Amino acid sequence: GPGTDFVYRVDSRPPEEIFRDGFRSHGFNRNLQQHLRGDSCAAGSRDSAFIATTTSLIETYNIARQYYSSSGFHGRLYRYRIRANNIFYPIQPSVNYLTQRGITFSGFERIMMREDNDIVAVEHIPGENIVEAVELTYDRFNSQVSDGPGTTNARYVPGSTFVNPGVIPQLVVP
Numbered sequence: 001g002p003g004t005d006f007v008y009r010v011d012s013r014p015p016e017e018i019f020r021d022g023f024r025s026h027g028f029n030r031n032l033q034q035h036l037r038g039d040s041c042a043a044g045s046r047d048s049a050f051i052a053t054t055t056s057l058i059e060t061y062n063i064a065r066q067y068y069s070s071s072g073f074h075g076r077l078y079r080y081r082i083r084a085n086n087i088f089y090p091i092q093p094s095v096n097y098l099t100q101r102g103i104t105f106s107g108f109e110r111i112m113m114r115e116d117n118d119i120v121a122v123e124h125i126p127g128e129n130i131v132e133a134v135e136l137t138y139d140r141f142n143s144q145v146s147d148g149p150g151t152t153n154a155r156y157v158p159g160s161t162f163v164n165p166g167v168i169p170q171l172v173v174p
């Protein structure tokens, strides 16, 4: 309904798995800077506490392009639309908190976070939060990403819910 926070996630797993199981984080590592760099995700230590999402549809195409054009990447990508709730945190309050704690974000990191569309979910997004999926198509010759077939999650639970506006609890502060 009106006002509800929705986010997107690009993932290689298909709706049949994801609508049923939802998303689960790699692990329980709450080092946010590590996560935001990608160091604790699939290409890294694979123990991130967080599940990455974005508010920006425009950003999802670019994320998908990055994955599609990487060497050894095969298979498909889907854009999931997700209802956000108190499991979801915009990163800015936490970045501000880490900064007050003496953690340094480089000029480059701050440029990457500039548009403020990043939202992380902690531990688990239920299948019932996921509205729908769209298979993404890739034309490697013109670096073009478009929407393929869409699928609706019949198990979606409607409601008007919002992100947690605060700092992520139990953050790791080295």
Ligand SMILES: NC(=O)c1ccc[n+]([C@@H]2O[C@H](COP(=O)([O-])OP(=O)(O)OC[C@H]3O[C@@H](n4cnc5c(N)ncnc54)[C@H](O)[C@@H]3O)[C@@H](O)[C@H]2O)c1
Pocket (backbone or CB within 6 Å): 008, 009, 010, 011, 012, 013, 024, 025, 026, 035, 036, 037, 038, 041, 042, 043, 051, 052, 053, 054, 063, 118
């Ligand atoms: N994916 C997004 O929509 C998205 C949005 C905003 C920012 N980012 C940034 O991209 C970087 C990587 O994020 P990501 O979410 O793509 O990495 P990720 O490790 O969460 O996902 C990459 C792939 O790993 C697999 N995967 C993820 N979790 C799994 C699990 N628990 N069990 C088995 N397989 C799993 C899936 O193939 C997934 O597509 C981070 O810096 C992140 O903040 C991603």
Ligand code: NA
Pocket (backbone or CB within 6 Å): 166, 167
């Ligand atoms: Na709080």
